[PDB]
Amino acid sequence: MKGFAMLSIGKVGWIEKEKPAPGPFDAIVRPLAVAPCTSDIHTVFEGAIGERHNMILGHEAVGEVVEVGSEVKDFKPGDRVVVPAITPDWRTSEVQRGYHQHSGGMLAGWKFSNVKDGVFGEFFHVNDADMNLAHLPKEIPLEAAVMIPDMMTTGFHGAELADIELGATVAVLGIGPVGLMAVAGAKLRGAGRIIAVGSRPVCVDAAKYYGATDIVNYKDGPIESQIMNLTEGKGVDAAIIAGGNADIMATAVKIVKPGGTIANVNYFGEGEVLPVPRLEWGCGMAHKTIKGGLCPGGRLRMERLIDLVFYKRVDPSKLVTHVFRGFDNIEKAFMLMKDKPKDLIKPVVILA
Amino acid sequence: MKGFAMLSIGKVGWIEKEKPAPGPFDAIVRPLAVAPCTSDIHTVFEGAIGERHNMILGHEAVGEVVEVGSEVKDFKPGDRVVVPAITPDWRTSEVQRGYHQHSGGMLAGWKFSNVKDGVFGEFFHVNDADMNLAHLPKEIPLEAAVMIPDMMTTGFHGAELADIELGATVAVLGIGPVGLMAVAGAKLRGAGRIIAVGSRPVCVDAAKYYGATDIVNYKDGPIESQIMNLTEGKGVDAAIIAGGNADIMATAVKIVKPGGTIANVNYFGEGEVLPVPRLEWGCGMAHKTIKGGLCPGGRLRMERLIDLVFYKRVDPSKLVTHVFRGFDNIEKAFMLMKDKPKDLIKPVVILA
Amino acid sequence: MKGFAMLSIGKVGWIEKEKPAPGPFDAIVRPLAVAPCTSDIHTVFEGAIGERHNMILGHEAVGEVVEVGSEVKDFKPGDRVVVPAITPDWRTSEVQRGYHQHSGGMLAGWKFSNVKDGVFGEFFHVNDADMNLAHLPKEIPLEAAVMIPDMMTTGFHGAELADIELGATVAVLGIGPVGLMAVAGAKLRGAGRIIAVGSRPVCVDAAKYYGATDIVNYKDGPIESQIMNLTEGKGVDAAIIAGGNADIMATAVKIVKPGGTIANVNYFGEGEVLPVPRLEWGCGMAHKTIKGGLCPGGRLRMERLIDLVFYKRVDPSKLVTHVFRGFDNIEKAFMLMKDKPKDLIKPVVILA
Amino acid sequence: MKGFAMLSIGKVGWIEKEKPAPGPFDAIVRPLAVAPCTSDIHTVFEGAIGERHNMILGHEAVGEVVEVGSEVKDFKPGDRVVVPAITPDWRTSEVQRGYHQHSGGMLAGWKFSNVKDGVFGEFFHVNDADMNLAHLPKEIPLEAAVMIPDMMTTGFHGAELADIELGATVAVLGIGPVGLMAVAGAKLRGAGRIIAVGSRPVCVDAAKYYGATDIVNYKDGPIESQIMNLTEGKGVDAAIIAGGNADIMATAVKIVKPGGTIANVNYFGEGEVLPVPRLEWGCGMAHKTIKGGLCPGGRLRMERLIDLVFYKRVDPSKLVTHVFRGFDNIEKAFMLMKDKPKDLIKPVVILA
Ligand SMILES: NC(=O)c1ccc[n+]([C@@H]2O[C@H](COP(=O)([O-])OP(=O)(O)OC[C@H]3OC(n4cnc5c(N)ncnc54)[C@H](OP(=O)(O)O)[C@@H]3O)[C@@H](O)[C@H]2O)c1
Ligand SMILES: NC(=O)c1ccc[n+]([C@@H]2O[C@H](COP(=O)([O-])OP(=O)(O)OC[C@H]3OC(n4cnc5c(N)ncnc54)[C@H](OP(=O)(O)O)[C@@H]3O)[C@@H](O)[C@H]2O)c1
Ligand SMILES: NC(=O)c1ccc[n+]([C@@H]2O[C@H](COP(=O)([O-])OP(=O)(O)OC[C@H]3OC(n4cnc5c(N)ncnc54)[C@H](OP(=O)(O)O)[C@@H]3O)[C@@H](O)[C@H]2O)c1
């Protein structure tokens, strides 16, 4: 079996491996459409998560079931499914507590391109098929559906953690593919005014399409200064961090009104500590709640997000700015994701 | 001062009263646009709430501040404002608990056309101006803005009580002006599939416009039977009761899946007890939560709802099917609301 | 294998069956101490749940693991464990939603003496051992530990559903073994004043021991009248229904203040509908939330409840008023539970 | 009027001022018993909150009403009341949002010894009497009741923010008078195992009395190392920060399991930023919620806490290790609070 993998930190390349076999509750799937993400770049080049050797990358894909284990009773070979980036082991204490994202350990729900071979291979392994797979309605376009496994589930999760109330004003820091989904998410939770912080024009247009009522560009001056000005010193009800450096945390605390919420969905790869401004946090008593969590996964999560797209509540296709054809282009899409060209949001590779 | 009032149960008419004066924290407002409601029909003809004598009716209006008390520091004469139907006394224990709707007692937050003169008069009294008034942006049309005081706040409240999750399937029982707002509310909370139950064609079109994906008509058979069929025996995640008789409660419990929520915003005027099916409620342990509450009010509530309309998140104008001009037409709009013509949703009377 | 079972509705007796075998994830346990519940009386004599034939009864027990399946990695033969009355199948959509009590259907989490042979036999089957079993510390007495499987978990669940705030006044309707645990539960959630409603002296003393500050006896007059008097017309913040007829629902709604919660843990076996007073429910808008649900189960639930007993936070032994020795006494304890003698709370049978 | 005040940062002394007068909704109260707090030390010597001039200190006291404004309808002169340290203005947007602690601005609910003269004077001013005062039952001892205005409300608030579930294991970092209340608070929310971190023997005994099952002393080694050892690498479900330096934040994040909560009630006076460990916070996705807030206040809050003490749910007297008699001793108690003698927890000054 052939697959695009991480040879060692800093080095990527194509490798040769054996086709995986399914257990009684597992399934083997082949990619119909895949997509790269900033996560793999952080892990490969920055070595954010230790060091791996010959580990296939990628964690966003849709495809068809090739073979299933003897116990899989909801999926048969041939079926087209949406595979969540987070495929947890449903039989742990963490699941009983309510946190499947950390089933087995901190961030353990995230297996692909972490502690398991990713989707950038002729085939990939999915554990607990009946629990971690969802049927993809033939009415949904491949390029759009491939945005569900991660970009959508993460962005929407930011809006969910933000405790948005009807009419509340929300600020989204960072408008990359995830940030853009966070904007659409805020609108889906009832937000009134939505302020997006970014720079690249491509992201700006997408932001407006998704619901952004105001765009703040970090160039015309400091973020906190501009937002405070825009809200007449009142600040925002909630802030969603979808990108930026460690210092973006300070900015977030500085713009949320007392009693507001700061919801983070950004993966911080550098720094030792994230700074929380003492004064702006009311010396520890401003009632400004800080949250941050891995995106949900599983069958149910996917089924619900599929319903939103199906019933035309959201249209993720606007995120796909580049489409490639062929297994070989996986390498191209990956590299393109590294040296971020000013007109790129999210590239997709159609395999069949 | 002249005003339309309830003489005694069953008898309505125009009366003559003295113009009210404001206290240091109060304000006197004159109606720019008003609108009748079924609530007043229930109270006048059915005597649902005891008996009143020469009490001016109505609780839905927008207008301008005529005079304010010595302490009112946020509103001056001439200012155009949106008046909430619920104007509570903000200094009570209930407010400290978090329920301003019952500030001073059960349903005490509702003063107009209950324990205080309504809006159907040349002038009306508003208590705690800085706490119960909101500036109306000149960009919002009068007929649309008059939908914010009651219809919108109540409908949206049903969706809030329903604990809707992204992608969840919601059922709205009753599609009158309030039901239609409940539909729009569910869409704003992230609902996927929304089923609306009604009959009159006018409401049906409005329902679809607001987000209804399926329409169920109580004529083609029993509601519960149809919905269960439509959802393949799975049922709905949440149900919002926006109309119907006492028996509609039984229907609601029958269609929600275990662990679901039943949110009521309907004002039951007849019956002694509302029936909760023992078997369908899992003999008391199906985890089906039942809620029901008076719509929120106050300045903050109105300001947030205004933002939704201002930023084009919702367009309430589609509820107004009849517009009249002149103080004298208040009586006409009222009568029209009683003998519900098949083409009526919500009538509005523009005074100036 | 011998066991006490339900032959047909109305007829009980000892039967002969084959010893069950465990699947790869299951376990076979033998009873060390058991106890009967009111539940089995309702099912056998009243036929509350259809009709069964030769089904072994009982859903409360502690014992040792006889044999385990090939996959069970946390429990070995010889180990002493606490078996929850609710043993759900952890791989269902309901579990992903968060309601393991209805895993597979409404009330599906409850298998023993329902859709599976109970504990009143030389051996019984436990599904998903690593997920539904908890090690019993040798410091906890058998008679006390046998109160954890149902009574404690159910009573405490009533307090959890009640949304009790620090200092809130709670009313517990019905002080049987479950009601008494509800009293102890309220105290553990921070309740201040706790009013218990009952009659039998034995339960009264137990109630006081567990935290009841006031005792209301339905004989000195109507419940609602007495409680309202005691609270100076203010009512209670929350009410937990732990017993009574269908009409107890009406009483509950009548005594809770607007915005309060009504939490039910009582199993209603008779009646067609449970009445919800229209006027007292504020005509559908008093904000009085009504809840009712099957007690939690599983390993985590039991482990946490064990910690409470271990660290002397609760002492369930006071519920055990009768202890018997020997397998043959199971029949006696059962009959005693039917013709409720005035001095009985909960009988226990020690087998070894 | 005489009173103990802050002359300038670093300098304290007795001053002479005019007796304050009440507004129509205010009241003037004289101290019956008062107590010093760490807060005043931070403000006076460290200048944590700008610079004040001749501002009377303290904000923890019980006393009797001397005179009331014309509108005060619940309190008359002579009545003994408990005065909350937090006395907010109940008519602000923040109150409508639900955060009275920040009514008027960040930390604006805290007036005494901040932006208003404290309680260390012959008389002091209380705004909104009917909203910010509670009748003190004559059965409660003065020294115990003086612990309610702030020590109790803050400690309990830590347990409330921690989202404690029945049986959960909680860690309390810092066992000063506030930490000790947080311990008692955790027990009141249903905690099973409670680990307290401290050193001074006096605090240790009090900790055990209040519910601490394990005591960790920062001397036998690093906190995180010891706790992780004690929990067998599992960690704690929640952590309450009741004392320590800025680095205690890092420690808190390091000991809570993924999905747990970190509740802070400690007032950080030094440092620029509070460090949040990137790796231990799962790079921003460990689902570890961080909260921090000013203690609640108002009449309702006090009434409920009074009920807990009245019904013997808690006994705060154990916090009072030093009692003084006479207005002159206020200076002594204050100084004693500065140079913390190893046998001090909380000193009280009885005035009459
Ligand atoms: N583990 C998972 O499954 C998972 C899932 C979703 C997301 N994540 C993580 O969350 C982050 C999401 O990134 P993405 O995929 O949406 O793409 P991205 O292009 O990295 O998005 C970054 C966004 O924030 C920006 N930004 C950079 N510096 C900023 C600053 N100083 N202030 C404010 N904004 C700034 C960008 O602006 P311009 O581009 O306009 O310059 C852009 O809008 C990544 O770190 C990703 O690893 C992880
Ligand atoms: N106190 C307040 O401030 C307040 C605020 C909002 C609402 N409310 C109350 O809540 C209710 C809202 O009514 P509304 O103003 O929206 O107007 P409405 O016209 O009374 O709405 C009733 C809706 O439910 C219907 N319906 C009648 N029988 C039904 C049945 N048997 N099964 C299912 N649906 C049935 C109608 O169908 P067709 O019309 O299609 O026949 C209609 O769609 C009223 O009782 C009102 O008093 C009170
Ligand atoms: N499925 C499960 O796993 C499960 C678990 C727990 C509980 N449950 C159910 O919940 C209920 C719990 O009962 P229990 O085991 O605690 O024993 P119980 O003895 O049946 O408890 C009944 C309590 O309520 C009483 N009561 C009777 N009529 C009343 C009335 N009219 N008004 C107020 N109180 C009245 C009793 O008073 P006196 O005894 O003082 O007369 C007693 O205190 C049962 O129906 C049980 O089946 C089911």
Ligand SMILES: NC(=O)c1ccc[n+]([C@@H]2O[C@H](COP(=O)([O-])OP(=O)(O)OC[C@H]3OC(n4cnc5c(N)ncnc54)[C@H](OP(=O)(O)O)[C@@H]3O)[C@@H](O)[C@H]2O)c1
């Ligand atoms: N604004 C308000 O109304 C308000 C209300 C309540 C509390 N607060 C604030 O919250 C804090 C509460 O302090 P307090 O009154 O309870 O008295 P405290 O004596 O300052 O309490 C400090 C506790 O944490 C300790 N500690 C010191 N260094 C530590 C370290 N490195 N690691 C772990 N623990 C350490 C102490 O241990 P030993 O004493 O055993 O050495 C003591 O147990 C204060 O900063 C106070 O200003 C403010």
Ligand SMILES: [Zn+2]
């Ligand atoms: Zn990704």
Ligand SMILES: [Zn+2]
């Ligand atoms: Zn109305």
Ligand SMILES: [Zn+2]
């Ligand atoms: Zn039972």
Ligand SMILES: [Zn+2]
């Ligand atoms: Zn203090």
